[PDB]
Amino acid sequence: SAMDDEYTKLLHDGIQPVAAIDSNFASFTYTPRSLPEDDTSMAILSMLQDMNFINNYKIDCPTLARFCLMVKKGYRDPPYHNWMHAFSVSHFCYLLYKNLELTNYLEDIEIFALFISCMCHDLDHRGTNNSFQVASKSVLAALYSSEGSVMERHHFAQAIAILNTHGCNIFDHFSRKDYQRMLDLMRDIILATDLAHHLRIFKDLQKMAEVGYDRNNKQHHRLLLCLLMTSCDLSDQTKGWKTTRKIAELIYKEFFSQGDLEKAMGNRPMEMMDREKAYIPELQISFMEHIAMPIYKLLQDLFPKAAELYERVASNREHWTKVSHKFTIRGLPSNNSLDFLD
């Protein structure tokens, strides 16, 4: 009944102007995690309206309201991979549309699929990675481990199950060809959120940046969609230090919870998931240097207006160096006690 009343208001109250959400809502400096969670489904509609996808694709408003609420309801509440992650990832997609002139690179339907994919891309995440599904012999691994990207395949399958729920298929009036196009795009984009996939295609992304984006090259469209998706997925790191500090808190809470479960199974966790071994400043510096910074450098190489995003990620990486010494205990602990030695 709670979703029913939320649905009723979403459908009948009208779609709030995007500027009424926040005055800096369309700026790379806005932090969408500042938005109260109760306001996020409306914000999704506002962004879809502002990009004109509602009118352009003649999206049925009742269906879209039900769809957005079902997607929100499809996220659990682990520390990091929750609906507020999917919301903030979607917002960054909107920022890319508002700031980077994506219409010069991608078709309308590709940009629309990118945004919907962002909303759906971690659906039903349980706060554990792909390796854990295999090691724990989960249902998800039984289904998908032969193909790889276990969780991402599950995320995609959940998105399709929402579309296949009566009253939720926002695409069900598309032509057969456009429908098939949309769902194929969603498969490719959601699967691209597997960082193992990013690392596999990285050289192809570099080669595309070096030779120059060819809008007539269908492989270039596919590569760019992957890079944009990954850029949305990591976009917390493009905000201010306080955002990235909090996000590291959430990541390691989730990781360490997985590691505790692996130890309870008799398995040595990855260092970054072992709360007895993980040295967070070193791990964050490694993540930023080897994964996050090269991604936003590629984005800047392709979109010069994205330079400020890379500079922020670089600044945040240098900040981890500046605070690393605070992970060393100088003097006595606050309680003046050495009890923690035992």
Ligand X SMILES: Cc1cc([C@@H]2CN(C(=O)c3ccc(F)c(Br)c3)CC(F)(F)C2)n2ncnc2n1
Contact residues for Mg ion, defined by CB under 5 A: 122, 193
The answer to whether residues 258 and 275 touch, using CB atoms and an 8 Å cutoff, is no
How many residues bind to ligand X according to rule CB under 6 A? Answer: 13
Report the alpha-carbon distance of residue 55 to residue 50 in Å, rounded.
10
Contacts 24+ apart (CB under 8 A), 53-58: 53/112, 53/115, 54/15, 56/108, 57/112, 57/174, 58/173
> Does residue 234 belong to the site contacting ligand X (CB under 6 A)?
yes
CB 51, CB 97: distance < 8 Å = yes
| Closest to ligand X by CB, 157 or 291 | 291
248 binds, among Zn ion, Mg ion, ligand X, none (CB under 5 to 8 A by kind): ligand X
122 is in an annotated binding site: yes
Q: Measured from the CB atom, is 68 or 272 closer to ligand X?
A: 272
Contact 284, 324 (CB under 8 A): no
- Annotated catalytic residue 220: no
Decide whether 63 or 158 has the Cβ nearer to Mg ion.
158
Q: Which of 26, 186, 208, 248 binds ligand X (CB under 6 A)?
A: 248
CA pair distance 84, 311, nearest whole angstrom? 25
In the complex, residue closest to ligand X by CB: 287
Asked whether the beta carbons of 288 and 320 are under 8 A apart, the reply is: yes
Site map 154..193 versus ligand X, x via CB under 6 A? ----------------------------------------
Tell me which of Zn ion, ligand X, Mg ion, none is bound by residue 191, counting a contact when its beta carbon lies within the kind-specific cut-off of 5 to 8 angstroms.
none
For residue 53, CA distances in Å to 15, 36, 73 come to 13, 24, 22
Query: Which residues 276-315 are close enough to bind ligand X by CB under 6 A?
Result: 283-284, 286-287, 291
| Cβ 79 to ligand X shortest distance, Å | 11
Q: Running DSSP on this structure, what letter comes out for residue 214?
A: -
One-letter amino acid for residue 111 of the chain: I
Segment interacting with Zn ion (CB under 5 A) among 164-172, 226-234, 258-266, 314-322: 226-234
Task: Give me the catalytic one of 81, 91, 198, 319.
Answer: 81
- Dihedral (Cα; 269, 271, 276, 280), 10-degree rounding: -140
Spatial contact of 269 and 263, defined as CB atoms under 8 Å apart: yes
Q: Which of residues 229-258 bind Zn ion (CB under 5 A)?
A: 233
Q: Where does this chain touch ligand X (CB under 6 A) — which range of 52-60, 105-113, 233-241, 299-307?
A: 233-241
Phi, psi of 93 (to 5 degrees): -55, -45
Q: Could you say whether residue 256 binds ligand X (CB under 6 A)?
A: no
Which residues from 103-142 bind Zn ion, rule CB under 5 A?
122
Is residue 126 within 8 A of residue 104, CB to CB? The reply is no
Binding residues for Zn(2+) are 85, 121-122, 233
Binding residues for Mg(2+) are 122
The residues that touch Zn ion, with contacts defined as CB under 5 A, are 122, 233
The residues carrying an active-site annotation are 81
The residues that touch ligand X, with contacts defined as CB under 6 A, are 195, 234, 236-237, 247-248, 251, 272, 283-284, 286-287, 291
